[PDB]
Amino acid sequence: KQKEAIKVYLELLEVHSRVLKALIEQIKLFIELIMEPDEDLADKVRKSSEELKKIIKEVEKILRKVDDILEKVKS
Amino acid sequence: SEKEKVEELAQRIREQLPDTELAREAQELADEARKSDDSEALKVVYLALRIVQQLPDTELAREALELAKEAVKSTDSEALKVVELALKIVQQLPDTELAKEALELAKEAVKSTDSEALKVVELALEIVQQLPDTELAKEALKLAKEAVKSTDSEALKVVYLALRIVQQLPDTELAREALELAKEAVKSTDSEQLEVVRLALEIVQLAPDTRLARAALKLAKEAVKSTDQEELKKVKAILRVASEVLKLEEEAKKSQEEVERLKQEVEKASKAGLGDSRIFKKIHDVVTKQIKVILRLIAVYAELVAIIG
Amino acid sequence: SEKEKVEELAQRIREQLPDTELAREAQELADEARKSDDSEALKVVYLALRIVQQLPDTELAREALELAKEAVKSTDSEALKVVELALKIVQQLPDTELAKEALKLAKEAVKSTDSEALKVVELALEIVQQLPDTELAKEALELAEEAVKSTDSEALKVVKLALEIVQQLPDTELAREALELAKEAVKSTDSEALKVVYLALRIVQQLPDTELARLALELAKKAVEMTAQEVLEIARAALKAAQAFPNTELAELMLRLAEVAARVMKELERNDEEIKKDDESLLEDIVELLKEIIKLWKILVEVSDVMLKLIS
């Protein structure tokens, strides 16, 4: 019912806070790369991108859970 | 009681060296102070007479008397505080070049009508007082003396920010880098370099002891060294974007704290049963704020993209 | 020379309809034009009198006489050209709503002394003359009317750019979309929407016949549809990024990212509407929001990779 939407919104809030942190790191590193080109800075930017991809995977898991619940409701 | 102290020092000075120019000037200054009801001017005159009693028949005492008279003439409280700090520096560090330089800087500050030069000179004097016998004090005093001469207000703001950075983190690489950058910016006649240095110093103050701060300092140094105008505008835009990113980071941290508190409150309300519609409304408010912060971050991302191209 | 033509038309009109208000107005206009030595004022009075001779005792002739008098009062060459084009349109499409609305717009332009409004109205009249008896001419005329009525300085420039786009690519999907977008922007009271629409139209004109132009048109339409200022700020940032870096795959990805973010905000609004009131519909809207969220983050990852390739 509504508690399911509540828990989905909570999961989204936590994921989006982690997104905020990763995005701030990514923008800081991009400014640093613009001002000075380095290879290790590019490596840590790639690490940030990997973190963002893991976040995307978590969002996909949330979506598949909600989809299973919707498919059970429609039955 | 301050009037009593001033008059007692006046009588002590009159008994110390009568029939001298310093004695007559001290008597007249003590009279003009007794006429006053302002305690700050009373402290000014007290420090002046204390310096006179400290060094009788000297040039420093004459400078102190003249500066104290000109400060009593002024109605601005900031000039009063500046003269107080200058005379107090002369008292704390006698027989030092910094005392004479600070007296000259305080005279130049009182003579100026601008309100920002008073703050700048007060900051320089506080730097001298808190860090005596240090290169930072002399460099800050020289920087303030150079800032008073410049016509541009941007130079005043830049030197204010540089002295602030020095006071916040003394004996750090950031402080000496900010001092050198502010000196080289005051030397340059260009105002765009002043804007770049101001933005870099603001980046430093917003995020002290961070990688962004030192990176922006190095970029501002190499931009002051450079002579390309397009790269100068690009550096200005990059520094503005960095400052916006710092502000957005603060906002995002506040939003994350809100998210944690909302999760706690949601679990508490689910345990208690206090109903679901109000919880959904609070969740909607928090989601709105967080997603607006995310969208601002995306906009800054696209702005950076436009800058690099 | 031209005075001869004007005075002959005046005497012929006097012989055609005596003891009428139109006769007195035409004679006064002819006398005032005869006193004037300017060639353009003489040509405008000639057109007005020829219109009076073509449509005697009609409202169009009265409005043309009044417009000719007001143009004689004005010294701006652009306003004179506007009045001349309006009268030539009246002659070109007699007894049409386009001619009446064009006379009205010409009067509204003459009233204002600003040069940008005169240029916009001249552009609209050139559109009407170039495409007579077409819906695009009607839309451009109404858009210019709405622009002149608006006090915002950006609205005039936006409408001028839209009309330039229409003239450059007539009877195209891009021109129709630009007309509708400019109309919706003038309808909007927000200035951020006007700036976003100007950026979109500038992207269309600066790079026609490209996917980025269509993307910018879609993004600007969806931004004007939304009432949120944040979506407009995102659209403005994305359009500035696209304008600064054209003919690139990364700008395409950036416009796509902005569109996905606008769709995410739309799904947020839908979720709010459903909260204000079924569980199944709420779950479906949550599913759609999660889909668009995943797309947004994927596009952000792609943008990050492309920027890393550009900086390395």
Author numbering:
A (entry chain C): 1 to 75
B (entry chain B): 1 to 274, 278 to 312
C (entry chain A): 1 to 277, 282 to 316
Show sentences the authors wrote:
Over the core heterotrimer in both structures, the backbones are very similar to that of the base heterotrimer crystal structure, but the resolution is not high enough to determine the state of the designed hydrogen bond networks. The designed junctions between the repeat protein arms and the core bundle are recapitulated in the crystal structures and hold the repeat arms rigidly in close to the designed orientations. Deviations between the crystal structure and design model in the repeat protein arms increase with increasing distance from the central bundle due to lever arm effects arising from the compounding of small orientational differences in the structures of the individual repeats. These structures show that the DHTs can serve as rigid interaction hubs in asymmetric assemblies, which have been more difficult to design than symmetric ones. Subsequent two-arm fusions were made by combining the two working one-arm fusions and testing nine more new fusions to chain B while keeping chain A constant. Eight out of the ten designs tested had three equimolar bands by gel; six designs had a distinct heterotrimer SEC peak present with the ABC species detected by nMS; and four had a very good fit to the design model via SAXS (Fig. 3f (row 3), Extended Data Fig. 3 and Supplementary Fig. 1). To test this idea, equimolar amounts of individually purified A, B and C of DHT03_2arm_A21/B21/C were mixed together and annealed to allow these interfaces to reassemble in the presence of all components. A monodisperse SEC peak containing all three chains by nMS was observed at the same elution volume as the co-expressed tricistronic version, indicating successful reconstitution of the heterotrimer from independently expressed proteins.
We designed helical heterotrimers with specificity conferred by buried hydrogen bond networks and large aromatic residues to enhance shape complementary packing. Crystal structures of a helical bundle heterotrimer and extended versions, with helical repeat proteins fused to individual subunits, showed all three chains assembling in the designed orientation. We succeeded in determining three high-resolution structures for DHT03: the original base construct, a one-arm version (1arm_A21/B/C) and an elongated two-arm version (2arm_A21/B21/C long). We show that computational design can create cooperative ABC heterotrimers that can assemble as free-standing helical units or as hubs in larger designed assemblies.
